[PDB]
Amino acid sequence: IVEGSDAEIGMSPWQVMLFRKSPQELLCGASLISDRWVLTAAHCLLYPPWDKNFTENDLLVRIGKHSRTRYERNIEKISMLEKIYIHPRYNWRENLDRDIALMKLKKPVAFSDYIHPVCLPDRETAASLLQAGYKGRVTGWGNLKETGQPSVLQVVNLPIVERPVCKDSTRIRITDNMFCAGYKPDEGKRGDACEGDSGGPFVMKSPFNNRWYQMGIVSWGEGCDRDGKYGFYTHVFRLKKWIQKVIDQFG
């Protein structure tokens, strides 16, 4: 996260760390959506152009964390993956269309002060909140600058951007399964996701029922925190029938 700040303890209890065991390194962010399901970006698990193709036994998840590196006794919980489900129409060849994947934990995780699932949006929540200028929150342990790793989880709040401005900002083909967020050059404020933040959540707090909803997944950008560039996020609501189909058929 560039130009964010340290998260407060317990601020993002659905935050999940996807950890590669060998070599021992942060792979990506992710989010807890129930006691046995974790949501992330497909490209965190499968990206053939960069020879990336992980299977369930290559990774472990760490839940409840704050420190990037310290073992958090009696706070964090480690989980193994039973099965990964990548969206069958995820477009790795081109633009990361449908950049979404679900991971089933072998054993359910116990909730606590530090571990708790985020909501997925219903139709009214999505309609009421997915408006240009409305801010969401991005969290992760990714790099602090484009060219630098944080000691603890970082957080930044960023406004959703109008779709024509998103499209003008990039040479990539932008689909209805993506939205973009970030400040414009004229707005003064800064902030962005960066490498290592991929797969983590973009959340918004509903003023109607006080609950946090995951509206996006950190998907891709061009550099980090560049003027006139924006981060792109998977449009969770638009893919929510797939999420439910997977959980209903395989949960």
Binding site: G10, P13, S34, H116, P117, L120, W212, Y213, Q244, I247
Partner: peptide
């Protein structure tokens, strides 16, 4: 069915609760 998810989703123990 998953539906709306956890009855308790999105309410943080150390904040909203």
């Amino acid at each position: 069915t998953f539906g709306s998810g956890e009855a308790d989703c999105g309410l943080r123990p150390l904040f909203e609760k």
